[PDB]
Each structure stands twice: as C-alpha cells, then as structure tokens.
Design a protein around this ligand. Structure first.
Ligand SMILES: CS(=O)(=O)NCCc1ccccc1
Lengths: 172, 172
C-alpha cells in the first residue's frame, strides 16, 4: 500500500486512528481514552465529535496534519470489494491484511454486540493468532481499497471472531 | 515472543526460511553463484541438498538458537489452504491464502517449473493492490496450521503474469 497511506495511521488510545485530511481523524469509539480532554494539543472545546456506534470522527478547527491532502472517505464499500486493513506491528513491521467485504451485519463477539460491514480475511484457512490475523490492539486500523487511480478509506477495525476468519469494519 | 515472520530472511535475489536453528530452505534460482560464506559461516562447513527449485542448507552450528524446530513436509494434501509468507523490501508483511493442487510440471511465463500448483484466494487480478506476488518474492515459505502444529511444505518458485497461478517447490 502507498507510503502516504501508512503516514496517516497514528497510534491512539488502546489502538489506532487515521487522518482523512489535515483536519479530519477517524477511529473506533472503544479505543478512545474515556478521561481524555485534549487531543493533538487542542482542547475538546475546539473539536467537532461525530459518533455513530463504533465509528467516531474528529474535525479540528486548525490543520493538525498540513503535510497531508484530503482523500475520499466512503460509507463502507460494495459487497465483494477486496480491501487491505493497514495494521502496524512490533518492529516498524507493516501488515496490510487482505479482506473480502460482505454485508452490513449485527453480531455478538466475545459477549459484546457489534454493528458494521462484515468481511472474511484472505490470509489463510483459519486466521487465529497474530501471524495471519488481527489482535485486540489493531482496533481503529483503516480499511482501504484502490479504484482506477484513486485510493479510498471506507471504515475502521472494530472487532474479529475467536476463529479469527470474520472481521467487522465500523462505517460512517 | 516467537513469530513465524522472524524465520523469513532476505537471501540472494529473494528470501529464505529458518526451519530450525541449523536448517534454512530457499528457492534454488535466488542463491548467489559466487560465495565463500553465508550468515558468517564458511561454505566449507554447510551441507547443500538441492532438488530442482528446492534447496536445503544444514549448518554445522546454531545460527538461530532463538528458534525451535518446525515440521517440514513434501507439499500438502490437495485442497489445503496454505499461507505464502511474503516479505517486501518496503517493510510490509503480506500473508496470502493459496488453495493447493497437484504436483506437476507447469509452463509459467517462458518456462517449465516442477512443484505443487496453487491458486490465490484474492483471484480477481492480483497486480495493482497488495493481492499477488512479484518476481522478488521467490523463496517465501508455504505454511499451514494442522492441529496445534505449524507445517512448512515448500518455497515460492514461480507465478503467472496473472490469472491466479503459483508454484511451490517441494523437498524430494
Ligand atoms: C499531537 S502532537 O502535538 O504531538 N503533534 C501534532 C501533529 C501530529 C499529529 C498526529 C501525528 C503526527 C503529528
């Protein structure tokens, strides 16, 4: 995946978030530190929060990341799209996990109720564990895909099943 | 904490894989043709076992004493979904699902390559996103999970321009 997309993935709370533009940051609601009153040097005062279940978007009144260009955020993707989940791991290692996207779904995962766009990992037979699959600390990682010329972001990592094969993308 | 990715190592014009502290496997065509040492050990002290596009090195001391010995087998049953553990010079780790077929001699781009056929589960077109192999990927290992055990069953030897087809070179 392009270096400019990896540059947009920021360590955040118990996971990650993603810079859509110099002013827009998206993440998974449950990774956000519940006590936090300041983000990227800005008071809560100065920030527009948009929360829809496990999807959260932050809009800043200042350019926090002026090195970036604004890219397309969409509300999930067509069923059958193959996406990459941009997961950073121990060592400066970069894991762009391939996922075939399915329907919008409501599930119970480890007792918690989750809603988003479901998908199946294309990494192995059974993706249980950290070599072929996701771990809890990957939540908030972006789902991206390429069109003709364009790259698109369509959601953030919310959950995965015990077997590790099924994932859920939180969407706008 | 141990990872299979730790055992994937840059080597000649491609990659190889540590099976054990003393055992390293790779694809014959990526090995340098001028060398007096590998991994600091004189070539005098290394057993080389070659069978077409599969080569095994056995060193006279532990090069990777941090590792345990893994199961190495001559290919896998047809229908097994393997993962090819691709490392890229970008720093990306790209595990891709491959459905394994028969042993055969296959015409790939110019040439005749003997080993176990497979097809990528990404099988749209696998060139433009991180969804297929490139020439520099040769030597990457084919692995799968069986009961509690990881098995390694060959090394990446060849791929078609693209429809979906790959060849895993195997021990014999
Ligand atoms: C939050 S900060 O004060 O340490 N820096 C602001 C700019 C920035 C934000 C996110 C990622 C990289 C840089």
């Amino acid at each position: 995946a392009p270096p400019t997309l990896w540059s947009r993935v920021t360590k955040f709370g118990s996971g990650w978030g993603f810079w859509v533009s110099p002013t827009v940051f998206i993440t998974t609601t449950h990774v956000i530190p519940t006590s936090a009153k300041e983000f990227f040097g800005e008071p809560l005062t100065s920030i527009a929060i948009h929360r829809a279940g496990e999807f959260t978007l932050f809009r800043f009144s200042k350019k926090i990341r002026p090195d970036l260009t604004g890219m397309i955020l969409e509300e999930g993707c067509p069923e059958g799209t193959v996406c990459s989940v941009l997961i950073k791991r121990d060592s400066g290692e970069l894991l762009p996990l391939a996922v075939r996207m399915g329907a919008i779904a409501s599930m119970r995962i480890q007792g918690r109720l989750v809603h988003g766009q479901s998908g199946m990992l294309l990494t192995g037979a059974n993706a249980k564990g950290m070599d072929l699959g996701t771990i809890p600390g990957d939540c908030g990682a972006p789902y991206v895909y390429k069109r003709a010329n364009d790259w698109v972001v369509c959601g953030v990592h919310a959950a995965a099943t015990k077997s590790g094969n099924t994932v859920v993308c939180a969407v706008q």
